[PDB]
């Protein structure tokens, strides 16, 4: 974990799996995401062609995740990653020659890299969440539903966090459905804005809630 966190600084999100005359293929996320780059056809091999002028015919992203078998966290990861691909239109207008491909794989890797880690934080909160009084986690379409419950603190409420592809730098939007006690929106706004927009924002925001509210 400390070892790899260092690893994160220089990103390594993809495997090259074909480098044809015809196409270059790259996988991501344990290979559940597949990028096929198709090149224009030529009368010569690509060894004879200048990469600054080799035209890209196509850019085709694919999810190969088993949606029946996947857990919700993994599903949310794919939801968010491809929401970004949609926004960038598969880089079809800007990534047009082979020359431009590394800066695209970088741009994409970064979002793949944070979204995959968000997946990780969720599976974690799913196993240690009780210690934070986080009794349940519900994922529904870009919405993260956190249920905190403690008789002892006499508080029970549900916080809904709205996630995007751009995690975790963007400040999350939230709402609170209150069950027991009187935690207000302002109390939540506060706790959130005291956590920096960098890795583990979810984990840290949960721990922040568990101190501010369940450890008085």
């Amino acid at each position: 974990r400390t070892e790899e966190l260092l690893d994160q600084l220089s990103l390594s999100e993809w495997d090259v799996v074909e480098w044809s005359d015809d196409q270059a293929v790259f996988t991501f996320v344990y290979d559940t995401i597949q990028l096929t780059i198709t090149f224009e056809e030529s009368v010569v091999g690509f060894p004879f062609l200048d990469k600054r002028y080799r035209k890209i015919v196509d850019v085709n992203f694919q999810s190969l995740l088993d949606e029946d078998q996947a857990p919700p966290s993994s599903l949310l990861v794919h939801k968010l990653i491809f929401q970004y691909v949609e926004e960038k239109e598969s880089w079809k207008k800007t990534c047009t020659t082979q020359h431009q491909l590394p800066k695209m794989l970088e741009e994409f890797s970064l979002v793949v890299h944070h979204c995959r880690l968000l997946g990780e934080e969720i599976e974690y909160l799913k196993r240690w969440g009780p210690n934070y009084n986080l009794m349940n986690i519900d994922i529904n379409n870009n919405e993260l539903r956190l249920l905190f419950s403690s008789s002892a603190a006499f508080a029970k409420f549900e916080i809904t966090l709205f996630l995007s592809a751009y995690y975790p730098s963007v400040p999350l939007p939230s709402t609170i459905q209150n069950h027991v006690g009187n935690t207000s929106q302002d109390d939540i706004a506060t706790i959130l804005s005291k956590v920096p927009l960098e890795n583990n924002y979810l984990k840290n925001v949960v721990k922040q809630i568990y101190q501010d509210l369940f450890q008085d």
């Binding site: 344990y30 088993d66 078998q69 996947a70 966290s73």
Partner: peptide
């Protein structure tokens, strides 16, 4: 984590 990231058959 193949567990969490299964592939279509």
């Amino acid at each position: 984590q193949r567990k969490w990231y299964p592939l279509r058959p």
